[PDB]
Write a protein that binds this ligand. Structure first.
Ligand SMILES: Nc1ncnc2c1ncn2[C@@H]1O[C@H](COP(=O)(O)OP(=O)(O)CP(=O)(O)O)[C@@H](O)[C@H]1O
Ligand SMILES: Nc1ncnc2c1ncn2[C@@H]1O[C@H](COP(=O)(O)OP(=O)(O)CP(=O)(O)O)[C@@H](O)[C@H]1O
Ligand SMILES: Cc1ncc(CO)c(CN)c1O
Ligand SMILES: Cc1ncc(CO)c(CN)c1O
Ligand SMILES: [K+]
Ligand SMILES: [K+]
Ligand SMILES: [Zn+2]
Ligand SMILES: [Zn+2]
Lengths: 309, 309
């Protein structure tokens, strides 16, 4: 009984968008209904790319489809990278109707807007999207996973310290989502530039109306390469694991990251093993070795440690 | 090193076409590049259905895509149900260019045209397709899996006996494919109406230019229900297994069928378990329990026996 309505992009080759969130969620037993928001030959990181996009009407046509056949009832709804403002809107209407359809509907949303680097950040999607995510989308999500950049954008506040971070996540919680995980930061991790720091924070409702707030910090070993898709693979698995541990933003993230590691490490290798001695791996060689990593996606060898508060 | 270019239909919900051939081929480690020939909400067997189709030009646009990025090199190419004559054509041009690209390119083709029943058969695709499959498509395929009906149509000859069958398969081999498996027949199996007979035949080239021809017969236990997708799931796995046993149309089919059984039996059950005591299962309940059957798709418990000649 695990149905997910993943609305994301599809590529014929490679792993990005729905191609990066389906296989996982399936080997881990989730019945994944996937709506391809676009179908391109490969991700836009390649030199060339040809494909088509689904517009707001078309997306609609499909929703209705599932309606007419009374099968528009899901547990989780997962979304990520979108370029059309109008499209994203539609997606909200849907998630809405869909929630009245099932109270315990968890909307896992990766507010994809852009990347940063010490301040030198910038959106890679139209700016007319920031308003929707902030005003329409985020308000209804129940689990968001933004960048440092992305979280800074939504909150309109820049992060300088870890404490400021935890306070930017609180501003998020006060936006709707009871789960917020800043998948990666520029903050120097207490273990050196070699690592990558990530921050998580979950809000639970106390039996007396009070507040309970767990917080964590996982430092992952960085990998020297430009990877396309990790944003999607992460959100998927997080959704998976946070289902097994409905109340352990700590336990989940641990598994979620560990696998991310296993995948990336096997990826970079096979990738490097195809350009050995003197050449930078092409984006066509850095694609995620998903299939080859199934073994880990299911039985993740926890090789990280969540630190509370 | 297992890349497949599966050109088939996609549904948001359910398992038919590419949704029925991808998950399998992946859990069994094949890097599957999937081109969705159409994207509908659910298969056309439901009361309603809404969706869009990819035309010949659009399909082209994607091929080129993989071209410009020099990644148009696959091992296997898998196709099935197509409704557009023009579309199928395109698909041949591609498979062609693609074969010059890699000699050992195996084109696995399921010549989907229609179903039969003692003679009362009829195509469920435009008749303007029979000519292409017979003249253009089949000539280039290296592994076809037709119906009794479908094989009768291609050969233009009706099957009455088992011997006539083996002779209809020979007429196929003489069309191109060195592998032909009539996935199911009306021929009474030597074990009663309760079973389903299927026939396989592989042509190998002898080291002296002579002829070697293995032949088999597997009787599978029938299941009392109308299942959509089994045609696709079969072709996938056959492609999988006939890769491990490049020369044992016997060994392969055994595994291919066994799993088909496991899937169908678990499917019918969960399906029946949702309409218990007095109601016929809806097509919305008969969908294939794919995810739930991964365990078998990989470790198929051989519960059948291939009979040579
Ligand atoms: N070069 C790298 N080294 C280590 N981990 C990396 C990595 N690239 C990605 N990751 C992993 O991917 C996850 C999310 O990555 P990140 O926070 O960079 O994504 P993002 O939101 O910028 C996504 P994208 O840019 O791909 O859309 C983290 O768990 C992180 O460990
Ligand atoms: N009702 C049933 N009972 C037993 N096996 C069945 C079945 N329906 C399908 N199968 C299995 O599916 C495989 C192919 O089925 P079949 O020959 O009926 O397909 P087909 O080419 O008519 C496909 P479709 O009509 O679904 O496109 C066989 O291996 C067969 O065992
Ligand atoms: C088409 C497409 N989809 C999804 C992503 C990332 O989630 C990328 C890479 N920007 C992409 O090019
Ligand atoms: C859209 C679609 N694709 C594929 C198939 C069978 O391979 C069906 C069922 N006819 C279907 O409706
Ligand atoms: K993120
Ligand atoms: K068939
Ligand atoms: Zn991202
Ligand atoms: Zn068929």
């Amino acid at each position: 009984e695990c149905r997910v309505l993943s609305i994301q992009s599809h590529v014929v080759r490679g792993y990005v968008g729905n191609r990066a969130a389906t296989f996982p969620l399936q080997v881990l037993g989730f019945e994944v209904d996937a709506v391809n928001s676009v179908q391109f030959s490969n991700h836009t990181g390649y030199s060339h790319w040809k494909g088509q996009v689904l517009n707001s009407d078309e997306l609609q046509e499909l929703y209705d489809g599932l309606k007419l056949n009374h099968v528009n009832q899901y547990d989780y709804v997962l979304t990520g990278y979108t370029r059309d403002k109008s499209f994203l809107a539609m997606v909200v209407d849907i998630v809405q109707e869909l929630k009245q359809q099932n109270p315990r509907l968890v909307y896992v949303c990766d507010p994809v807007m852009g990347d940063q680097r010490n301040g030198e950040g910038a959106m890679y999607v139209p700016d007319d999207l920031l308003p929707v995510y902030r005003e329409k989308v985020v308000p209804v999500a129940d689990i968001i996973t933004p960048n440092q950049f992305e979280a800074e954008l939504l909150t309109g506040r820049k992060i300088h310290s870890q404490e400021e971070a935890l306070e930017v996540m609180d501003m998020l919680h006060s936006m709707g989502p009871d789960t917020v995980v800043i998948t990666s930061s520029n903050l120097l991790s207490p273990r050196g530039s070699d690592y990558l720091m990530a921050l998580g924070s979950q809000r639970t409702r106390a039996p007396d109306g009070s507040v309970v707030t767990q917080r964590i910090r996982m430092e992952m070993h960085k990998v020297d390469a430009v990877f396309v898709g990790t944003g999607d693979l992460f959100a998927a698995m997080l959704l998976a694991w946070t289902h097994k541990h409905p109340n352990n933003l700590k336990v989940a993230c641990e598994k979620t990251v560990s696998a991310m590691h296993h995948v990336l490490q096997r990826t970079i290798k096979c990738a490097k093993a195809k350009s050995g001695e003197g050449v930078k791996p092409s984006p066509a060689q850095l694609e995620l070795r998903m299939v080859q990593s199934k073994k880990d996606i299911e039985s993740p060898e926890i090789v990280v440690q969540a630190t509370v508060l």
